[PDB]
UniProtKB/Swiss-Prot annotation:
Changing F360W: Loss of (5S)-lipoxygenase activity. Loss of (5S)-lipoxygenase activity. Exhibits a major (15S)-lipoxygenase activity. Exhibits a major (15S)-lipoxygenase activity. Does not catalyze oxygenation of arachodonic acid to 5-HETE. This is Polyunsaturated fatty acid 5-lipoxygenase. Changing T591M: Increases arachidonate 5-lipoxygenase activity. Does not affect leukotriene A4 synthase activity. Fe cation binds at H368, H373, H551, N555, I674. Its main location: cytoplasm. Changing S272A: Loss of phosphorylation site. Permits export from the nucleus. Serine phosphorylation by MAPKAPK2 is stimulated by arachidonic acid. Phosphorylation on Ser-524 by PKA has an inhibitory effect. Phosphorylation on Ser-272 prevents export from the nucleus. Phosphorylation at Ser-524 is stimulated by 8-bromo-3',5'-cyclic AMP or prostaglandin E2. Residues 119-674 form the Lipoxygenase domain. Changing A604I: Loss of (5S)-lipoxygenase activity. Loss of (5S)-lipoxygenase activity. Does not catalyze oxygenation of arachodonic acid to 5-HETE. GO terms for cellular component: cytosol; extracellular region; extracellular space; ficolin-1-rich granule lumen; nuclear envelope; nuclear envelope lumen; nuclear matrix; nuclear membrane. It catalyses: (5Z,8Z,11Z,14Z)-eicosatetraenoate + O2 = leukotriene A4 + H2O; 18-HEPE + O2 = (5S)-hydroperoxy-18-hydroxy-(7E,9E,11Z,14Z,16E)-eicosapentaenoate; (18R)-hydroxy-(5Z,8Z,11Z,14Z,16E)-eicosapentaenoate + O2 = (5S)-hydroperoxy-(18R)-hydroxy-(6E,8Z,11Z,14Z,16E)-eicosapentaenoate; (18S)-hydroxy-(5Z,8Z,11Z,14Z,16E)-eicosapentaenoate + O2 = (5S)-hydroperoxy-(18S)-hydroxy-(6E,8Z,11Z,14Z,16E)-eicosapentaenoate. PANTHER family: LIPOXYGENASE (PTHR11771).
Amino acid sequence: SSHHHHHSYTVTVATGSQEHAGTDDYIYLSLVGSAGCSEKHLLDSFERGAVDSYDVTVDEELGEIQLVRIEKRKYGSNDDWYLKYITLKTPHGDYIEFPCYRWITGDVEVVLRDGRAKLARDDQIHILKQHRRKELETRQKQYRWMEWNPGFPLSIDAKCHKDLPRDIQFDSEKGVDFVLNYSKAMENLFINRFMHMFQSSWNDFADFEKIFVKISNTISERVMNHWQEDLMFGYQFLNGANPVLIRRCTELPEKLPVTTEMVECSLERQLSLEQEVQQGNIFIVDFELLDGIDANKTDPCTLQFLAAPICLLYKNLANKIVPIAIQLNQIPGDENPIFLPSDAKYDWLLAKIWVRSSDFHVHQTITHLLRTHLVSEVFGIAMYRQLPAVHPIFKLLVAHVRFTIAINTKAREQLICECGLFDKANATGGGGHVQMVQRAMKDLTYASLCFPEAIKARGMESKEDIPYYFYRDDGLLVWEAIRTFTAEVVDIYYEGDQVVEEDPELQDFVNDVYVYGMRGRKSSGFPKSVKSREQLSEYLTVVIFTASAQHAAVNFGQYDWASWIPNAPPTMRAPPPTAKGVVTIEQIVDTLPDRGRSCWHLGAVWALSQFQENELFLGMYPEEHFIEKPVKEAMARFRKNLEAIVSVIAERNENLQLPYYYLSPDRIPNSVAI
Ligand SMILES: [Fe+2]
């Protein structure tokens, strides 16, 4: 597809591969040399995926080339042009590359530095210092902060996807489109007939299983057959879709008045409950955050209900963690019983179903939305505002914030907006899901996002004591691989800690995240400034890990584990049981979501779990912002490292009844894009 035009600099221009990447409009190129600029030469039709070469000879001698300038002048229609990169081969024999990876509308001229990475401190001539300063001044008018809802992290200043800068939109306007992807998911799953039966209950578990067997995958079929098993219930806290809430229990809360006699049948070591606690064998999962959140009222006909359960869990003689007591609300009472696996069959099944519906809410809104998407958009915005394209940290982070602002904005326009599709199936729809974010912000700390540290704060770090925590195990290896990569990057570009402390754009980028993203909350623990290479290396690992590995661990298991509804009910249509011996299976069915919500849930988890045809997986950096040998060798090592992790995860999972593969580096996107 390479087209050479001969008629001197050799100027090659690479157009992009995406749908509308090509243009028919006139293209003018200029060279800014150390010794004076050049004319506005007309290269002249750049089709998608092209590589066009033009011979260009200048009316004067320019010296070393500092900048390349691009201008697009309409021809007929307004045709946007995606520009990958420009190269020159000079009369002296020098090859210089200028990375772009931006959308050129006719609105603004584009000016690109040669792709070596440069700190402000490197630029001492006016030609470069003015470009750098004018680039940031332009970023900061283009990428602005805005509060979408009160108390939230701040987000991009755009009502809808259309108003975003083209540079950060999706390559097609509705290529990723929640409202179409959800309904299209519901044809493929073939539950178009139940889409609008928001009043019809599944006749019994069989009637829903008819629908599900058609559409089951490996894990979701295993969940269909084993979801009533306590072993599976417990298993998900460590290795399902939301494996971050459990923690080792060091003293039993006063709010859980559970005694040894109540759970002697579960205990297996000839020890009392208190002794089991002192020994590290008791674990807890406490949904107090759900205490007081409003239940969804958007539908007058159907009543939605929420709980705030306490779930006590026991590591048995086989080192599996099983549930041994469940209180469905926070304030103990006689109408808030402690349900036990010794209870009537449906009392304890129903109790376990409420804990699963609770895990789901906390997962979707907090773990998923707040703590991977919103957090990531924050980093993305601060990055575009404060880090010019030539800065090493922009070259590094930009891959990892690709379509992050675009997806989050399509969601605020459509999914979690007022009267959005989130309200169709979830009991935190209506507004409850905004309160959850507000009250969760108090816990959104920098330390919580340091994966090892965060695992230890939950007392879950010991592999000897807790040996089936595959989420932890894989996370730790991917965290360290990123840790090794970012540290190689900072060490390449920052020879000492003083260089890190004295980098104004790096400090502003970090200060932007703390003041605007996190609202300047002292309790957030975010750095106001980074003053060492170690601290920056860790900071960078936080950004990348949150955006790839954490987002992929909590996002791509959604269909595996929530497509069998009774294992992850988005909503509940009856309040929790206040007493034992009352609940019947017929009453559990009528509590579970109707056919209608059930289907909107199924498309949702289906769509959200898909990979794009040409997804970019961790360490795949087709856009060469970096072009220098040492950082490209760091990246190669990063690729070799991630693959070694893929080999050990695959070896592990061949031995497992239910493989954990969400954090296998070959399935972890670079960024939050769905
Ligand atoms: Fe996501």
